[PDB]
Amino acid sequence: AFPSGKVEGCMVQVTCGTTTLNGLWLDDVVYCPRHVICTSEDMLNPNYEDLLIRKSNHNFLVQAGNVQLRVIGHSMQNCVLKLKVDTANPKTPKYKFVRIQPGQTFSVLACYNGSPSGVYQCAMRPNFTIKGSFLNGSCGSVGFNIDYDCVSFCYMHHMELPTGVHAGTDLEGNFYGPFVDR
């Protein structure tokens, strides 16, 4: 329901090896789910600390349309990866990070490979999941609310559960509910 223009100008494509998903570009940092550094066999019992050390900056390919962002640093904050790039996003809006509760509504900008596809109003169920096919294949899409001119990011999609529901974190990397990225 919220207009998505301010958020569209922050969405990017993040690729590591064969994995490609959405990232959020604010200032000179790109936020994305940390399981992007995982391969197929990694996602069963991943050592995220060992994988972080194994990857170099040039293992990360970040694209904002045709502009290519050069990764000059990468750190991990809970379950989100933070990629420092060599350029600040000139379209960075006024923003803050907030943590919400189930039952509260927010708008989700569903993207695929960095391209905005739709915006939808939804809410987490009491078990901290979201039911909706609109998000299938949208790893890294973010949820948000607009407080006048400020964009409050409150959600990042991380994974689809076997039961067709979706799990995610806040922008500090803390999962909503008891879920784990393994």
Numbering used by the authors: 7 to 188
Text from the published report:
In Severe Acute Respiratory Syndrome CoronaVirus 2 (SARS-CoV-2) and its closely related SARS-CoV, a single copy of the main protease (MPro, nsp5) encoded within the polyprotein (pp) 1a and 1ab mediates its self-cleavage (autoprocessing) at its termini (nsp4/nsp5 and nsp5/nsp6) and other cleavages between nsp6 and nsp16. The fully active mature MPro is a homodimer, with one active site per monomer, and exhibits a monomer-dimer dissociation constant (Kdimer) in the low micromolar range. The active site consists of a Cys145-His41 catalytic dyad. Domains I (residues 8–101) and II (residues 102–184) exhibit a chymotrypsin-like fold, and domain III (residues 201–306), comprises a cluster of five alpha-helices connected to domain II by a long loop (residues 185–200).
To understand the structural implications of our solution measurements of the enzymatic activity and inhibition of MPro1–199, we obtained its room-temperature structure in the inhibitor-free form at 2.25 Å resolution. MPro1–199 crystallizes with two independent molecules present in the asymmetric unit of P212121 space group that lacks a crystallographic 2-fold axis. The two independent molecules of MPro1–199 do not form a native dimer. We modeled residues 7–188 in both independent molecules in MPro1–199, whereas the rest of the N-terminal and C-terminal residues are highly dynamic and are not visible in the electron density map. Indeed, an unwinding of the oxyanion loop is evident, starting from Gly143 that shifts by >4 Å away from the catalytic Cys145, opening the substrate binding subsite S1 wider. This conformational shift squeezes the stretch of residues 139–142 into a short 310 helix, which pulls a whole loop consisting of residues 130–138 closer to the newly formed helix by 1.2–1.6 Å. The organization of substrate binding subsite S1 is preserved in MPro1–199 relative to its structure in MProWT even though the N-terminus of the second protomer that usually caps S1 as part of the mature homodimer is no longer present in the truncated enzyme. In the absence of the stabilizing effect of the N-terminus, the side chain of Glu166 rotates from its position observed in MProWT, where it hydrogen bonds the N-terminus of the second protomer toward the oxyanion loop. In the new conformation in MPro1–199, Glu166 makes a 3.0 Å hydrogen bond with the main chain amide NH of Gly143 that was part of the oxyanion hole in MProWT. The structural studies presented above indicate that the catalytic domain encompassing the region 1–199 of MPro adopts a native-like fold for residues 7–188 with an unwound oxyanion loop conformation (E), which defines the catalytically inactive state of monomeric MPro.
